[PDB]
Design a protein around this ligand. Sequence first.
Ligand SMILES: [Cl-]
Length: 286
Amino acid sequence: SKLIRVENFEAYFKKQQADSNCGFAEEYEDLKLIGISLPKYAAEIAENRGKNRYNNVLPYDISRVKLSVQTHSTDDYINANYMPGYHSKKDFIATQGPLPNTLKDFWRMVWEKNVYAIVMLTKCVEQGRTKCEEYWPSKQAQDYGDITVAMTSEVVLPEWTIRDFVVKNMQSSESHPLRQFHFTSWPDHGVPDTTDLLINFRYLVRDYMKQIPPESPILVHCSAGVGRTGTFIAIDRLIYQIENENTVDVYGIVYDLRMHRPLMVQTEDQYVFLNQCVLDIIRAQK
Ligand SMILES: [Cl-]
């Protein structure tokens, strides 16, 4: 009974918000251990440890994105997992902000996994610390291993920047577009003050995704690719749920996310923020 009909969501939210979000805290605490016993052997292989941004954010083997192998099995490794969306088990790839040594891997994943959209939910640097490499080029083409990327346009707003690229595999002469939705306005601490901007940003991503071929995972990342990333993915899923079923199951969504990657929706504030998102969406349904 974690399924809440939208007609009952506001009352549910108020209930869960009582006593300093006690109910939300309880739901979130219930999620705490979900997925954590899933093996993460590839992530722990010596050769792969340095490919992880955070030693405690490791992809579960069961859902990890496996890249092509060249000379060594560990070539398959990237700190990323397929995350189900509303429609399919591979609607998303949640991944960490790539490192200087995983840039090639990052683009190889982008290429091999048919990514046309990247959602980036972090600044490269937040509070004087590197959260993510600037892994994308300007107009001047850059090669990342066999993958060449050139930015074709960039539109900056205070809230987010949207960048279009052409991604080409130089080995095959295949290419296709990629749009990167760079949400630059997530607060350095805590969640956004309001939900509308992130929700509108999600709508922008979705608007673009309508133009994209099938089986094209949205690559979503922040720093660790779990907190903001999980929040964004959950919001996307919740919106479909609301739109298609008039029900929400934030718990079920986050649970599912946790079964695919650790820490998805990494703070209680984020979890409450999701519920706030649902409330705002429902309320904004005149
Ligand atoms: Cl699954």
